[PDB]
Amino acid sequence: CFPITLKFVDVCYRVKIERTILSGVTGMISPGEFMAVLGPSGSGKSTLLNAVAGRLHGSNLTGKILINDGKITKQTLKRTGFVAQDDLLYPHLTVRETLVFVALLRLPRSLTRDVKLRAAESVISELGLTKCENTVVGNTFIRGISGGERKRVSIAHELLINPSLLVLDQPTSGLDATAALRLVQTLAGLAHGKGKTVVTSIHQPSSRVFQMFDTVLLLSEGKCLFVGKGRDAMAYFESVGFSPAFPMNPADFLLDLANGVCQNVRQTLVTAYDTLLAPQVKTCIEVSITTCIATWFSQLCILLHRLLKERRHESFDLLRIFQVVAASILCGLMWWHSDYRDVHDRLGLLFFISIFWGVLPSFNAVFTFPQERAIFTRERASGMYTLSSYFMAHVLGSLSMELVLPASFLTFTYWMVYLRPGIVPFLLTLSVLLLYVLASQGLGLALGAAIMDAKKASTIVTVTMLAFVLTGGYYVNKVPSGMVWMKYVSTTFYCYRLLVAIQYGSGEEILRMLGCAGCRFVEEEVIGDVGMWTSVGVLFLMFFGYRVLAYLALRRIKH
Template sequence: MLVSRETTETNSSDGGAANFQQSSSRGVRSSFPITLKFADVSYKVKLPDCSVKSRTRGLRNMFTGGPTTLPDLENPVAVIHHHQERTILNGITGWAAPGKILAILGPSGSGKSTLLNALGSRLHHGHGLTGSILYNNLSKPVTKKTGFVTQDDVLYPHLTVRETLVFCSLLRLPSSVPKEEKISVAESVINELGLSKCENTIIGNSFIRGISGGERKRVSIAHEMLVDPSLLILDEPTSGLDSTAAFRLVTTLCGLAAKGKTVVTSVHQPSSRVYQMFDDLLVLSEGRCIYFGKGSEAMGYFESIGFSPSFPMNPADFLLDLANGVCQLDGASEKEKPKVRQALVSSYNNLLAPRAKSASMDTPHTAPNERVIETTKYYGCTRHFSTWFNQFSILLQRNLKERKPETFKFLRVFQVITASLLAGFMWWHSDYRDVQDRLGLLFFIAIFWGVFPSFNAVFAFPQERAIFIKERASGMYTLSPYFIARVTGDLPMELILPTLFISISYWMTGLKPELSAFALTLLVVLGYVLVSQGLGLALGALIMDAKQASTMVTVTMLAFVLTGGYYVHKVPYFMSWIKYVSTTFYSYRLLINVQYGDGVGISTYLGCSSGRQDRATCKFIDEDIRGQIHPAMSVSMLMMMFVGYRLLAYIALRRLRA
């Protein structure tokens, strides 16, 4: 007998449940039970074409003993195309009811994750997916009432548990709900999932010490629980956990199911006590179903068709052996074992499949259709979500908290201070008349603050891709507030380190001892940093692969540096266009203009026109200082690049799909 969600909340003494009931009365939550039915679900993917050259094959067979049919001499390289498809799922049928846990068991590669993606509306008909999937007898997905927990925990590592869930609550719950109540919902979820002890601990990752694996998985579940989903789908939530942590996690899922939720989860190798907690069980083997029914009746079914373990063992281990085609029947030869899987599929099709299909169609749903439509519409309407500015402000706060530890970590600050001190000592109180050395210093500044910010920024979007796709799929925000918050949040932090660099190296190297010159130099460097950062963001968003993007930004900056004007003055004609799109070229010219102006003064002072100075120095003056473009042109080009690179990154993100 199922207990309704409302009854459970009313009679529960848990503080979190009480908060849920209070929130529901204000319209934050409108929970209703969902009966999930799926029949004959299949999924196929197309493989790359296989091309066979007939002449080559015919000649090879002549030497290897194969068929020696002569090839077509008029068409000696005839190509035969084979269009192949791979079946991931093949006619899966079953259902999941409110108040129960449906566990999908099977070895790696059996199709568990694909089936969950189909049930969670992450695969669509017409793209290889066939069959029917119904939610309370409706084919329209109720995505706003479905929580999907992926196998990998996609969380920000530097945020605490409480910050993670509070920010998620502020973004996912409707804008009509007061901020205090959204925070209260997050706190109630923390209490319900037993995260109170670690709520002020950062999430962490493989490189940063944080909460445990089991706690991290519960945070992922809490992410979805904030919207009080009626259908909760989890992809191998116990992977990587020890048996005790896995048992605690499944106990939590049982508690959620007891409140009227429909829970569907895949498991790889559960312990015996975890297995006993599953109400219904679906066993997959290479995309085919070999059992669907009650978990407690699985062993009896397989025993009835002649498959039973030769010694007492964990039922899950035995079922996985069968799904892998491994049979422990006494006297079974090695040649007979590969036939085990075929026998299991045949038995299922003859004994269980007809009953499963019939029962799937006859299973009553527990909520009227009209209520499903109304609730889906309620959650899908954009006016019930946060406004653009609210999304931007929340994302900006989250970005500042997440990025601060990474931006000001010891190694990065040490790198900048060390570079500034090296530059200061190498060009210690350089002489105004030593033009070559000073131009070398200015070009070093242009190189360092071109490569450093662009290389750091190129990892931004590839590293956040999984989080971005997941949160966009959940409807937490639109692209524009995320992008602008991401770019804006980086500005104050990315500009502090170059300010520190210039403040140290400028006075140590003895550059123009005027406050206005120092301010202009700093302004040029800060602007150049922002443009270089935009270049990194654009390349990262376009490529979306950290290694490939870092390679591309390295090659791009190398081209910009070589054509920047200091190393080579006479760039080959076919490469000369690069300098006009080079950020280094324009920033180097502006830095020169701040120190030497139009170059007339230094040229006259050194006597280049009268031949009193060496030829090399005068050549640098003529080609680097006096031969520069107008500063207004350099500023205009850098401003265009500042906007253009970020616009390119935004367009690239718009094309990004899960």
């Protein structure tokens, strides 16, 4: 156990459209207590819950928000559960597969599997989800579960973390009259039977749901009108002058007073709060090893299989492989019947392969992290997993299909053109082309993680790659000697220098075959200047270096 006492004193919040959203909201909620935050629409009660959760800060917010007499630490955000108002889930897992991945990641690890699975399916039977558990969670384009079943998957998503402070933002909207009573009876058993601290906002409770709250907060356009016990609310407003004509729901009467339609009703109740109850609240706020490298790897295995079955359907594209294959038959027919002695044509084949496999991996990889932006952000604030195992699961998860496409391109082009016979110069050509595809993929990952949308990022990578083609070593013969150093930054340069070295070597065979346009051209472009091992040792430095800079760009995003 780790009991949280929450305090918030004089919380204000301005925004620039200057509009005051919250102004002077003081309260305190203890462990063992279930509090409701009532109010009209726009009164500010999802800005107040979003500041005591720790997801709203800056120079707009002003006021002391205290969790056990201290600031909001990184330690206290691991014991806090926050169920937001909009639901962000994966559109391809089923309801049971969604709630097993949460149970394996977040439950105490010194606990056997098949007990973590009998915790995930005793939550399904408490929320009534045992009819749609084999149904896929959908989105706007994939039709799946209901809106009231999607709401209860998100509450189960936080009820499997076992929090110490549970903050919910309208959990009963979209639920009928019987499912909303049972959910409030569940949350009242956490507060009264386990000693937790539950804060919730709620819109249309019945007279039976309203009798289960220990404490009511009533907002009205950013200023509170009542803080105290729910069984004192109707007897407070009678002593100020307001009472219902016909007997009715007490939660219907308190929302007429907050709208001011209970027959200056609002401004009477604001200054009557600041002289009768507001001083006595701030008087009450004065006193009241090898088991560590197994948790990294098991988080990696869960995050792999979760992303392999996102791409199971909507993917396994034969369309990507039947188009790269037709482009390799197309290149192999343009250079059908070219000869080994024609050096000027063979170096234009080898430079087009460098253009093709620098442009194609790099432009595809710019979609990887921007297409995860809303769900990565939400799960980073929860504390689900570390970043170095989320990152490494996307490195290893892309690497299968990214290596089948260059290997099937080159099997057609190498033997139709009939470049150089032997199994040894074929496999060296295959492995240089697979090291260049991985170094070109990491350029697109780093620019998609720094710029977090794909339309803005796939403009920066198109101009950057066309500048690597220009300084890559084919287009200009004399460069101004003061711009010769720019080719040592280009990835395209080090691949094209390695493919020419496998085919023609260090001269010395074409120079005896071409005799010695025949012996002048083959001394600037065939002989070369960068060694064969330093062109390999720099494509490894761009392999690791472009994935380090993609990790540091994702490290920024925090809340």
